[model samples]
Target chain A: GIVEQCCASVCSLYQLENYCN
Target chain B: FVNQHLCGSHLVEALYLVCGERGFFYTPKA
Candidate 1:
């Protein structure tokens, strides 16, 4: 669960910032 | 969860590899 959540969190952050641009 | 805390974890080794040692910023290790 830790790695999955880790991936998701990184994915989420990237989505919010650069992924928006 | 806190936005800053998102980058906090031991699993960050993968983060270092995939994200280029990059966190929300340029490079977590830098």
Candidate 2:
């Protein structure tokens, strides 16, 4: 389940930091 | 998962692949 968690963590970080204009 | 993803697994890849798992995974790889 680490991978999934890792993915989620990364996803959140991306959403808040990168995925933008 | 601390400060390592800041390179090959984070900065370079993460920033470039954000749209992937978000349902837009890119394909400009090896």
| Residue-level lDDT tens digits of model 1 in B1-30 | 223334445444434444552453323342
Cα shift from native, residue B27, model 2 (Å): 23
Docking class of 2: incorrect
Give the per-residue lDDT digits (tens) of candidate 2, residues B1-30.
332324335543654544455543322232
Instruction: Flag clash pairs in model 2.
Output: B20-B25
What is each predicted model's overall lDDT from 0 to 1?
A: 0.38, 0.38
iRMS, model 2 (angstroms): 9.6
Residue B27, model 2, lDDT: 24
Pairs that collide, model 1: none
- Worst 10-residue lDDT window, candidate 2 chain B: B21-30
What TM-score does each model's chain B reach against the true chain B? 0.31, 0.24
Give the 10-residue window scoring lowest on summed lDDT in candidate 1 chain B.
B21-30
Q: List each model's interface RMSD.
A: 9.5, 9.6
What TM-score, to 2 decimal places, does chain A of model 1 have? 0.24
